[PDB]
Tab-separated table of C-alpha atoms and ligand atoms in Angstrom:
chain	number	residue	atom	x	y	z
A	57	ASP	CA	-0.012	-0.158	-0.177
A	58	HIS	CA	1.478	3.278	-1.202
A	59	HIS	CA	0.337	6.873	-2.227
A	60	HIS	CA	1.294	9.103	-5.414
A	61	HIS	CA	1.564	12.489	-5.104
A	62	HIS	CA	0.401	14.217	-8.551
A	63	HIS	CA	1.707	17.434	-9.994
A	64	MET	CA	0.262	20.598	-10.936
A	65	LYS	CA	2.327	23.688	-11.934
A	66	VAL	CA	0.031	26.986	-11.149
A	67	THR	CA	1.691	30.016	-12.585
A	68	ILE	CA	0.797	33.439	-14.284
A	69	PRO	CA	2.985	33.405	-17.122
A	70	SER	CA	4.768	36.958	-17.534
A	71	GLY	CA	3.118	38.023	-14.414
A	72	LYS	CA	5.116	40.356	-12.107
A	73	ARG	CA	5.289	40.170	-8.356
A	74	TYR	CA	3.859	43.722	-7.738
A	75	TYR	CA	1.496	46.117	-9.620
A	76	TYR	CA	0.421	49.654	-9.269
A	77	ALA	CA	-3.192	50.644	-8.873
A	78	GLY	CA	-4.448	53.692	-11.499
A	79	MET	CA	-2.231	52.688	-14.282
A	80	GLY	CA	-4.723	50.625	-16.445
A	81	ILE	CA	-3.033	47.396	-15.795
A	82	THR	CA	-4.788	43.903	-16.233
A	83	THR	CA	-2.529	40.944	-15.131
A	84	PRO	CA	-1.957	38.326	-17.600
A	85	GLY	CA	-4.332	35.084	-16.966
A	86	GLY	CA	-3.444	32.332	-15.027
A	87	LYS	CA	-2.106	28.975	-16.215
A	88	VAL	CA	-2.707	25.570	-14.639
A	89	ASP	CA	-0.883	22.397	-16.072
A	90	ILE	CA	-1.476	19.065	-15.011
A	91	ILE	CA	-7.893	14.518	-12.054
A	92	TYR	CA	-9.894	17.775	-12.187
A	93	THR	CA	-8.966	21.043	-11.073
A	94	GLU	CA	-10.562	24.313	-9.814
A	95	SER	CA	-8.685	27.679	-10.089
A	96	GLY	CA	-9.328	31.343	-9.376
A	97	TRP	CA	-8.023	34.710	-8.203
A	98	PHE	CA	-7.762	35.566	-4.699
A	99	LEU	CA	-7.545	38.905	-2.755
A	100	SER	CA	-6.072	39.281	0.590
A	101	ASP	CA	-7.872	41.156	3.665
A	102	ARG	CA	-6.176	43.816	5.216
A	103	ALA	CA	-6.077	42.487	8.583
A	104	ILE	CA	-4.245	39.048	8.571
A	105	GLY	CA	-6.700	36.731	11.209
A	106	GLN	CA	-5.682	34.716	14.361
A	107	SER	CA	-7.549	42.014	15.972
A	108	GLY	CA	-6.199	40.964	12.459
A	109	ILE	CA	-2.653	42.247	11.450
A	110	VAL	CA	-1.720	44.450	8.920
A	111	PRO	CA	-0.514	42.969	5.729
A	112	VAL	CA	3.128	44.492	4.543
A	113	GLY	CA	4.574	44.378	1.146
A	114	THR	CA	7.409	41.985	-0.299
A	115	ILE	CA	8.575	41.095	-3.672
A	116	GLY	CA	10.446	38.180	-1.925
A	117	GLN	CA	9.525	34.586	-0.510
A	118	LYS	CA	9.633	33.029	3.025
A	119	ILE	CA	14.793	34.518	10.214
A	120	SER	CA	12.192	36.979	9.234
A	121	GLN	CA	9.168	37.508	11.617
A	122	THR	CA	7.155	39.301	8.919
A	123	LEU	CA	3.546	37.716	8.808
A	124	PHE	CA	1.837	37.008	5.326
A	125	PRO	CA	-1.684	36.412	4.983
A	126	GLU	CA	-2.813	32.585	4.555
A	127	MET	CA	-4.788	31.071	1.724
A	128	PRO	CA	-7.627	30.576	2.094
A	129	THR	CA	-8.506	32.108	5.501
A	130	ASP	CA	-7.014	35.781	4.701
A	131	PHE	CA	-8.285	36.022	1.425
A	132	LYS	CA	-11.356	36.451	-0.456
A	133	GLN	CA	-12.320	34.915	-3.868
A	134	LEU	CA	-12.249	37.727	-6.648
A	135	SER	CA	-12.607	35.440	-9.740
A	136	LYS	CA	-13.854	31.767	-10.177
A	137	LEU	CA	-12.247	32.274	-13.794
A	138	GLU	CA	-8.602	31.859	-14.955
A	139	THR	CA	-8.549	35.180	-17.100
A	140	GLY	CA	-6.496	38.225	-15.900
A	141	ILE	CA	-7.573	40.611	-13.056
A	142	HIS	CA	-7.695	44.628	-13.995
A	143	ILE	CA	-6.345	46.092	-11.045
A	144	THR	CA	-8.423	48.686	-9.005
A	145	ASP	CA	-8.185	51.275	-6.297
A	146	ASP	CA	-9.608	49.099	-3.778
A	147	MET	CA	-6.802	46.511	-4.148
A	148	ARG	CA	-4.009	48.855	-3.059
A	149	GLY	CA	-1.792	47.274	-0.003
A	150	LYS	CA	-3.240	43.779	-0.381
A	151	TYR	CA	-1.759	40.401	-2.107
A	152	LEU	CA	-3.430	39.158	-4.999
A	153	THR	CA	-2.849	35.626	-6.044
A	154	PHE	CA	-3.715	32.883	-8.721
A	155	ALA	CA	-4.337	29.658	-7.308
A	156	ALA	CA	-5.829	26.225	-8.165
A	157	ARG	CA	-6.670	22.878	-6.370
A	158	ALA	CA	-6.658	19.416	-7.452
A	159	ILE	CA	-10.121	17.431	-7.032
A	160	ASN	CA	-9.568	13.376	-6.870
A	161	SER	CA	-11.859	10.484	-8.342
A	162	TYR	CA	-13.696	10.467	-5.031
A	163	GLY	CA	-14.343	14.343	-5.210
A	164	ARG	CA	-11.564	15.173	-2.608
A	165	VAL	CA	-10.389	18.699	-2.706
A	166	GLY	CA	-6.868	19.340	-2.041
A	167	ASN	CA	-4.939	22.283	-0.984
A	168	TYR	CA	-4.679	25.393	-3.017
A	169	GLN	CA	-1.371	25.727	-4.753
A	170	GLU	CA	-0.511	29.275	-5.845
A	171	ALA	CA	1.780	31.198	-8.360
A	172	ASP	CA	3.760	33.544	-7.128
A	173	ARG	CA	2.101	36.398	-5.354
A	174	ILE	CA	1.201	39.999	-6.297
A	175	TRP	CA	1.514	42.840	-4.070
A	176	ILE	CA	-0.575	45.902	-5.188
A	177	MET	CA	1.475	48.789	-4.288
A	178	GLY	CA	0.031	51.299	-1.779
A	179	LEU	CA	0.884	54.267	-3.608
A	180	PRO	CA	-2.110	56.250	-4.532
A	181	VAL	CA	-0.631	58.523	-7.001
A	182	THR	CA	1.255	57.482	-9.950
A	183	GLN	CA	0.887	60.195	-12.587
A	184	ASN	CA	4.541	61.418	-13.479
A	185	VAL	CA	6.273	59.255	-11.080
A	186	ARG	CA	9.979	59.370	-11.618
A	187	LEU	CA	11.215	57.336	-8.620
A	188	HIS	CA	9.402	55.153	-6.119
A	189	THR	CA	10.896	53.218	-3.409
A	190	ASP	CA	9.145	51.473	-0.439
A	191	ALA	CA	11.576	50.214	2.003
A	192	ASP	CA	9.536	47.147	2.807
A	193	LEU	CA	10.455	45.853	-0.612
A	194	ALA	CA	14.330	45.885	-0.040
A	195	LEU	CA	15.943	42.460	0.439
A	196	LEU	CA	19.001	41.254	1.672
A	197	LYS	CA	21.545	40.014	-1.103
A	198	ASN	CA	24.386	38.057	-0.833
A	199	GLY	CA	26.383	37.173	-4.425
A	200	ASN	CA	23.262	37.314	-6.772
A	201	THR	CA	20.740	35.701	-4.395
A	202	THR	CA	18.377	37.548	-2.782
A	203	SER	CA	16.428	36.782	0.730
A	204	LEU	CA	14.363	38.456	3.404
A	205	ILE	CA	15.743	40.934	5.597
A	206	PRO	CA	16.320	39.142	9.102
A	207	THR	CA	14.197	40.697	11.964
A	208	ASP	CA	17.055	41.942	14.047
A	209	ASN	CA	16.781	45.742	13.960
A	210	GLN	CA	20.497	45.787	12.563
A	211	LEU	CA	21.297	47.802	9.979
A	212	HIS	CA	22.561	45.618	6.688
A	213	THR	CA	24.443	47.054	3.803
A	214	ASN	CA	24.200	43.823	2.074
A	215	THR	CA	20.888	44.935	0.281
A	216	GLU	CA	19.032	45.384	-2.950
A	217	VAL	CA	16.753	48.602	-3.140
A	218	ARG	CA	15.269	49.526	-6.393
A	219	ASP	CA	13.028	52.277	-7.956
A	220	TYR	CA	10.048	50.090	-8.085
A	221	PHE	CA	8.385	52.561	-10.765
A	222	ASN	CA	10.821	52.002	-13.559
A	223	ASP	CA	12.471	48.800	-12.027
A	224	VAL	CA	16.151	49.992	-11.675
A	225	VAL	CA	18.420	48.726	-9.143
A	226	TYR	CA	20.175	51.389	-7.136
A	227	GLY	CA	23.930	51.129	-7.067
A	228	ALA	CA	24.614	53.299	-4.014
A	229	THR	CA	25.095	51.380	-0.445
A	230	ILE	CA	21.581	51.633	1.110
A	231	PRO	CA	21.367	50.350	4.793
A	232	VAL	CA	18.110	48.720	5.738
A	233	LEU	CA	16.705	47.489	9.071
A	234	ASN	CA	13.910	45.131	9.385
A	235	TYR	CA	12.292	45.239	13.052
A	236	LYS	CA	8.869	44.184	14.586
A	237	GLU	CA	6.852	47.182	15.500
A	238	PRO	CA	4.816	46.698	18.621
A	239	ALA	CA	2.125	49.268	17.729
A	240	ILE	CA	1.379	47.319	14.587
A	241	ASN	CA	2.268	43.845	15.611
A	242	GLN	CA	4.013	43.310	12.416
A	243	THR	CA	7.372	43.898	10.962
A	244	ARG	CA	8.309	46.962	8.610
A	245	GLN	CA	11.446	47.921	7.149
A	246	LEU	CA	13.457	51.280	7.278
A	247	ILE	CA	16.228	52.860	5.042
A	248	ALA	CA	18.947	53.926	7.590
A	249	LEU	CA	21.460	56.159	5.650
A	250	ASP	CA	23.728	56.726	8.636
A	251	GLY	CA	24.914	59.792	6.968
A	252	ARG	CA	25.268	58.008	3.707
A	253	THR	CA	23.696	59.875	0.788
A	254	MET	CA	21.435	58.712	-2.131
A	255	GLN	CA	22.183	60.797	-4.861
A	256	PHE	CA	19.729	61.246	-7.923
A	257	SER	CA	20.863	63.151	-11.077
A	258	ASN	CA	19.781	65.113	-14.020
A	259	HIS	CA	16.592	66.584	-12.317
A	260	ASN	CA	15.378	70.158	-14.079
A	261	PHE	CA	14.160	72.150	-11.244
A	262	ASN	CA	12.643	74.617	-13.450
A	263	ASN	CA	9.832	72.292	-14.279
A	264	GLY	CA	7.043	71.001	-11.488
A	265	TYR	CA	8.708	68.766	-9.126
A	266	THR	CA	7.363	66.848	-6.100
A	267	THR	CA	9.245	64.746	-3.442
A	268	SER	CA	7.336	63.103	-0.799
A	269	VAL	CA	8.793	61.058	2.053
A	270	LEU	CA	7.767	59.164	4.895
A	271	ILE	CA	10.008	58.829	8.021
A	272	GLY	CA	9.962	56.375	10.665
A	273	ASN	CA	9.335	56.666	14.627
A	274	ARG	CA	12.741	57.303	15.921
A	275	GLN	CA	14.875	60.190	16.781
A	276	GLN	CA	16.615	61.462	13.659
A	277	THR	CA	19.171	64.494	12.434
A	278	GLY	CA	20.740	65.640	9.633
A	279	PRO	CA	20.184	66.557	5.911
A	280	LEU	CA	17.122	64.706	5.092
A	281	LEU	CA	16.563	65.845	1.842
A	282	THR	CA	18.827	68.526	-0.237
A	283	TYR	CA	18.029	69.785	-3.709
A	284	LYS	CA	21.579	70.831	-5.234
A	285	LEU	CA	20.074	73.187	-7.550
A	286	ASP	CA	23.306	73.639	-9.497
A	287	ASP	CA	27.313	73.439	-8.810
A	288	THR	CA	27.065	76.467	-6.445
A	289	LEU	CA	23.227	76.700	-4.969
A	290	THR	CA	21.853	74.219	-2.807
A	291	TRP	CA	18.446	74.175	-0.710
A	292	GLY	CA	18.071	71.548	2.046
A	293	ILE	CA	15.956	70.432	4.939
A	294	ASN	CA	17.602	69.660	7.978
A	295	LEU	CA	16.243	67.722	10.725
A	296	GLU	CA	17.243	68.465	14.700
A	297	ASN	CA	16.534	66.267	17.760
A	298	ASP	CA	14.411	68.181	19.161
A	299	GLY	CA	12.117	67.886	16.035
A	300	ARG	CA	12.489	71.333	14.840
A	301	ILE	CA	13.305	71.684	10.851
A	302	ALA	CA	16.102	74.023	9.432
A	303	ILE	CA	15.865	74.990	6.225
A	304	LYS	CA	19.312	76.365	4.395
A	305	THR	CA	20.110	78.096	1.189
A	306	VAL	CA	23.862	77.937	0.418
A	307	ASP	CA	24.836	79.990	-2.563
A	308	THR	CA	28.890	79.711	-2.684
A	309	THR	CA	29.039	82.769	-4.854
A	310	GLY	CA	22.457	82.347	1.714
A	311	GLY	CA	20.603	81.643	4.778
A	312	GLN	CA	19.095	79.618	7.342
A	313	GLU	CA	15.724	79.573	9.054
A	314	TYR	CA	13.266	77.341	11.112
A	315	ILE	CA	10.188	76.176	9.965
A	316	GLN	CA	7.623	78.192	12.319
A	317	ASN	CA	5.606	76.304	14.692
A	318	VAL	CA	6.833	72.774	13.697
A	319	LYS	CA	8.232	70.316	15.924
A	320	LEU	CA	8.146	66.698	14.578
A	321	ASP	CA	7.138	64.125	17.412
A	322	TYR	CA	9.470	61.092	16.490
A	323	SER	CA	6.981	59.105	18.784
A	324	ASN	CA	4.941	58.713	15.439
A	325	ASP	CA	5.667	58.379	11.590
A	326	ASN	CA	5.940	61.701	9.594
A	327	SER	CA	5.434	62.406	6.059
A	328	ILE	CA	7.191	65.339	4.583
A	329	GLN	CA	6.280	66.708	0.749
A	330	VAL	CA	7.869	69.338	-0.971
A	331	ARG	CA	6.541	70.825	-4.157
A	332	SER	CA	8.313	73.157	-6.459
A	333	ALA	CA	8.488	74.922	-9.988
A	334	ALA	CA	10.367	77.694	-10.944
A	335	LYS	CA	8.317	80.978	-11.592
A	336	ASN	CA	9.515	84.740	-12.826
A	337	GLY	CA	13.062	83.660	-12.527
A	338	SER	CA	12.853	82.230	-8.811
A	339	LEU	CA	12.320	78.597	-7.281
A	340	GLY	CA	8.930	78.685	-5.445
A	341	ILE	CA	8.931	75.740	-2.794
A	342	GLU	CA	6.111	74.614	-0.563
A	343	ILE	CA	6.441	72.171	2.192
A	344	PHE	CA	3.530	69.743	3.791
A	345	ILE	CA	4.377	68.137	7.068
A	346	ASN	CA	1.575	65.158	7.498
A	347	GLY	CA	-0.574	67.084	4.868
A	348	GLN	CA	-0.485	70.740	6.143
A	349	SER	CA	1.519	73.265	3.897
A	350	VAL	CA	4.001	75.052	6.661
A	351	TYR	CA	6.423	76.645	4.305
A	352	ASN	CA	5.957	78.447	0.873
A	353	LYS	CA	8.990	80.581	0.048
A	354	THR	CA	10.928	81.555	-3.187
A	355	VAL	CA	14.606	80.871	-3.650
A	356	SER	CA	16.181	83.588	-5.809
A	357	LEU	CA	18.060	82.486	-8.889
A	358	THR	CA	19.720	85.947	-9.724
A	359	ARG	CA	21.657	87.268	-6.922
A	360	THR	CA	24.760	85.976	-11.373
A	361	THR	CA	21.939	84.018	-12.657
A	362	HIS	CA	21.618	80.261	-11.547
A	363	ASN	CA	20.959	77.797	-14.223
A	364	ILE	CA	18.678	74.720	-12.239
A	365	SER	CA	18.255	72.713	-15.517
A	366	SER	CA	20.446	69.902	-14.069
A	367	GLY	CA	20.338	69.524	-10.489
A	368	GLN	CA	20.578	66.778	-8.123
A	369	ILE	CA	18.049	65.503	-5.522
A	370	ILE	CA	19.857	63.887	-2.237
A	371	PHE	CA	18.474	61.950	0.477
A	372	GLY	CA	20.712	61.807	3.416
A	373	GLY	CA	21.057	62.417	7.287
A	374	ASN	CA	21.030	59.958	10.323
A	375	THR	CA	17.285	59.183	9.210
A	376	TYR	CA	14.680	56.355	8.987
A	377	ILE	CA	12.870	56.470	5.700
A	378	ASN	CA	10.304	54.181	4.927
A	379	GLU	CA	9.248	55.462	1.606
A	380	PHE	CA	9.854	57.902	-0.915
A	381	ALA	CA	8.630	59.120	-4.457
A	382	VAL	CA	9.889	61.707	-6.766
A	383	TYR	CA	7.143	63.186	-9.227
A	384	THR	CA	8.106	65.222	-12.402
A	385	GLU	CA	4.660	67.381	-11.485
A	386	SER	CA	4.247	69.660	-8.605
A	387	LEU	CA	1.156	67.868	-7.447
A	388	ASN	CA	-2.019	69.455	-6.683
A	389	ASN	CA	-3.683	69.688	-3.166
A	390	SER	CA	-5.763	66.553	-3.769
A	391	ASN	CA	-2.988	64.638	-4.829
A	392	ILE	CA	-0.813	66.057	-1.898
A	393	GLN	CA	-3.517	64.753	0.543
A	394	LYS	CA	-3.986	61.530	-0.910
A	395	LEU	CA	-0.335	60.891	-0.445
A	396	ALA	CA	-0.547	62.200	3.202
A	397	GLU	CA	-3.458	60.189	3.944
A	398	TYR	CA	-1.761	56.827	2.192
A	399	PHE	CA	1.313	57.535	4.604
A	400	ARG	CA	-0.458	57.925	7.475
A	401	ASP	CA	-2.735	54.649	7.069
A	402	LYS	CA	-0.048	52.388	5.489
A	403	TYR	CA	0.227	50.358	8.655
A	404	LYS	CA	-3.225	50.645	9.801
A	405	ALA	CA	-5.367	47.371	9.543
A	406	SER	CA	-8.725	47.084	8.587
B	15	CA	CA1	-1.776	18.136	-7.301
B	16	NA	NA1	4.086	49.193	-1.535
B	17	NA	NA1	20.622	40.256	6.627
B	18	NA	NA1	-11.299	43.883	6.292
């Protein structure tokens, strides 16, 4: 007396490990290769059950304490068909999966076998994205093999971090940590530059730009975000330990002032968004902290004329960055608020 195991290949040919909403994406269809099968598409809840816990993104596969949704109890059936799924806004921050199960001669239903899972990015505004990095998707890299970052609250420099919008691997050394956050009873990741920088070149600051950043709930200091407008003119945001924010303009051919009435509470996460565009030969800059617009000033380009057509965006400091996006648009108020709401609720279960 013995038992045979029979095989199924369950895939999404050409499918990716993540997609954005708001971009007109429809996934490729699923495929099952084999007595009978039942297949379909499933979408996770926003609370992973036993007070459910919030799901967090990955493009890797299960050292790590991250909790991932379990099939089938943490999922709802989206389709009984195999054809591809049109991504909708309601799917953001959830896992989408194609799965199939075998049924035997006696009607007995096996366990679901999944294709590679799809994380639907939380980012609610995709128009004009130039760079997008979610620290939760960073992986550990040893040689050419990647794996999940261990939940040890240590800065690892053997990492792989991308601009996920264009699917480009960053070459800079980017330390990342993974830790269990008690406020959410779930892990998350933070880019921890520790004084290093991430330097992005060829940015035309005459045109509309928005840089949106979510920083973590730890004390931080240093030059979180700097715009190197040209070879001699620089504008930057500097964090202090007390939570005050210093804005500095340096013209090596400026000034320094604190944002008025602003004290970041590092007990919480905080979002900082900067929108800018040139007008009348000066660069106008507006800063939103947690969705409120605290600072709205202009930087003179003539006081000798500064050509800001090929500047740099530089992240730095002793900071903890959970997510950032750079847009080649000065986003309107509605979109600034959509981003602020997303950043506030990224780790809220529901
Ligand atoms: Ca089987
Ligand atoms: Na994401
Ligand atoms: Na590691
Ligand atoms: Na729910």
